[PDB]
Assembly symmetry: C3
Amino acid sequence: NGYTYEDYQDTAKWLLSHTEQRPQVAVICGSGLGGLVNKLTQAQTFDYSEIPNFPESGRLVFGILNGRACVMMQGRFHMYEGYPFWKVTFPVRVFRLLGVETLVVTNAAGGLNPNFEVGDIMLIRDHINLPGFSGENPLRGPNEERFGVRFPAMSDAYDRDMRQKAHSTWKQMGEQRELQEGTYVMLGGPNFETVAECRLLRNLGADAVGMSTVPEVIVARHCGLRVFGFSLITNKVIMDYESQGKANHEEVLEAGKQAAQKLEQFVSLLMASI
Amino acid sequence: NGYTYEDYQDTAKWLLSHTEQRPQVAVICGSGLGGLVNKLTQAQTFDYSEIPNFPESGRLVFGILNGRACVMMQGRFHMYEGYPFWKVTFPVRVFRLLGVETLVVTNAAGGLNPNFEVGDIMLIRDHINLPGFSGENPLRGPNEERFGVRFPAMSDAYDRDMRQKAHSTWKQMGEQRELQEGTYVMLGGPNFETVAECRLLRNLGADAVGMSTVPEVIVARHCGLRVFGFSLITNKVIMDYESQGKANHEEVLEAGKQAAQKLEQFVSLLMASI
Amino acid sequence: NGYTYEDYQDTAKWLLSHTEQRPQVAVICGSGLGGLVNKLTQAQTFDYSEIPNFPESGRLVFGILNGRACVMMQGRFHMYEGYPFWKVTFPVRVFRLLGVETLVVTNAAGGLNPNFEVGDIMLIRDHINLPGFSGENPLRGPNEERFGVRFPAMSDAYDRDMRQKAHSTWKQMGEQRELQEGTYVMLGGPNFETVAECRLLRNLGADAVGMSTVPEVIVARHCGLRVFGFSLITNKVIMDYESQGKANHEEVLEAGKQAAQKLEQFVSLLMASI
Ligand SMILES: O=c1[nH]cnc2c([C@@H]3O[C@H](CO)[C@H]4O[C@@H](CP(=O)(O)O)O[C@H]43)c[nH]c12
Ligand SMILES: O=c1[nH]cnc2c([C@@H]3O[C@H](CO)[C@H]4O[C@@H](CP(=O)(O)O)O[C@H]43)c[nH]c12
Ligand SMILES: O=c1[nH]cnc2c([C@@H]3O[C@H](CO)[C@H]4O[C@@H](CP(=O)(O)O)O[C@H]43)c[nH]c12
Ligand SMILES: [Mg+2]
Ligand SMILES: [Mg+2]
Ligand SMILES: [Mg+2]
Ligand SMILES: [Zn+2]
Ligand SMILES: [Zn+2]
Ligand SMILES: [Zn+2]
């Protein structure tokens, strides 16, 4: 870890003296949810560039959403951009020092489960941390007891009650497609997977594949935060050689734009379940 | 990535001013194919040590092979020697700047498919990038748009037409053994795999296991190169505990020497299919 | 690798001039076996802090155990603490330079095999090196021929004869539970695995999961050492979502304390089988 405990405190101190807002919930906006910061009331924005110690991008926005005090990251950091996990997850620890109690994390992912369709929303019930198997972990290094324990458990990382309420909220929205729920696997990227790799990941028990989130969840659980997350299925991964399809970021972005309104409403409504 | 865009250009410039040769095809010679540089006509060799910015080894040879202008790497770089992938793949980007359009990559690999025999040639139809799952990727870092896109697809990395023609060429050579075709999995090395690991890799869907190639293919596809590759099966990996066999580099080298003449003829002939 | 050949020699020289002991066996004490150093006779201890070049912790103890000259590490190094594998395995090469011929390595591990119970001892018959698949390997870098070969085989890493004798010794101890034997998989840590990851590891063929040992075994085999190892099953990993259990280090430590007397007797007795 490159940051000292003091660096985290210094950043939290700067934020507390520049806004009267005191968030209880933090939201890391993944693909398709970037526009959520526009729904906040009594909002205050800080470009990441103005906040001491923050990694380069991106804006941090404080405000009220459906009755809850929130702090949102419009744009996140990725291992594929060259960032070490201690940088990617820096904001999570700052949020804890600010008084946050719940972390909502979202992303865009390729569908491995054959029953998923583009546009589906998949609640993350569990994850598979591939980089972690090789030691690439935000917790690598001496443990800071002021945040958490040396060996934190992860089998109960995704809050059960929040997932239960998510389905209830979904029914109230009267959506046609059912709300999916499964396992998210994280890999480094930035290239899209080969057919052999996709077949491999599905056989490992994964339902969706992406390049983020897991590191943030690990750090959040370590410092005691409640966690809720979901993936927007932006594409169905290619599983055979006779297929003419091919993953492409252009289409992925469009899927995100198409689901934007739905994702924003979903999140706003679930604020009351926290 | 440690190299700047300018470093690549500088190296390409040095090469262009030191030889009149203008290659259209690049060949990275793996185990057993080191002698191919001796078949080139109007050849010109440069030890890697004389080329500015080149990683340490190894010779770069320009020349004509069966009617095609080529540039060949006699000796490649490996992650197990301590090289980061941005170093291992440096030559691939230089080749693109030189005007190359097709990359032929070869290697020696252990056979996982039970039907393979020592001496067999396996066309690479797909790959599994294990280091990539953990973020070890030549593309890690800010993307250079002058080479390619941020999220390149890899499901169609190994050119279908070239593989089709490879089988046709094989029949004309009248070989006894059939030309194999499957999935190559790359791992770091340098130790040979345990029985448990071999069983694991086979269950992942891999047909052959090696310690190179994949990084070069990823960088090649990113910058638009057409790719063709194959593995020389130098040994059948140990799959059980009651077996007395044991992988050893001495035997692997001998298998390469035994297939040398065959590999050289095969490559020379397939030059006309490009 | 950060250490020079001379660094290893310098450390071995310091140790040889500070004790008359000349060990033939080295024991790296994992969880639950820390108290074994108290059974040595004619013992001499060196805190790791007093030995030039040694990584930070931990004590190195020389002495006689059941008739054999030994050198034991009371405390080991882990990748999750931030140590590169060339640091974690430094002592193994020093032991070889001292004249050691056999390495005994032990650890605490989570049980993946459904038949294992807390307190069980599992002889390590094989391993799966996940960090190694991505290149994280103590042998990464130029090879030092004075220690071993560039491509060492690992399929016969765990000595068959010693495992055979281990079962004989077990019967003489008249234990109620049978001595288990299987595959150990190493991952980075420090967090405990999710349910999805545990299901994944079991399907890979692993019987126990831990965060050490493998790197030490790889380096030992490379320099010619005979190797014997075993895991103390400190907990049964959570394999389903309806389970209320959850891995926790407190319970893991207690399991180690409960098996301490048994582990110490087991090791002392097997000294005669070396
Ligand atoms: O098929 C996929 N494989 C791996 N990743 C992805 C993604 C995610 O969107 C981007 C590429 O279009 C990648 O960048 C991240 C985006 P996010 O911050 O996780 O929402 O994860 C990947 C979508 N589909 C796939
Ligand atoms: O059984 C194998 N497992 C992993 N790698 C290999 C290899 C390859 O040859 C060398 C060891 O003899 C290694 O070095 C590279 C050679 P290449 O540049 O990929 O042709 O990949 C490995 C052969 N058999 C096996
Ligand atoms: O369930 C487990 N998963 C991964 N590791 C472990 C362990 C090992 O004990 C510690 C955590 O309690 C970790 O630290 C090491 C200890 P050792 O030096 O290998 O004996 O490996 C892990 C026990 N149970 C599990
Ligand atoms: Mg700044
Ligand atoms: Mg030079
Ligand atoms: Mg010291
Ligand atoms: Zn100010
Ligand atoms: Zn000149
Ligand atoms: Zn002294």
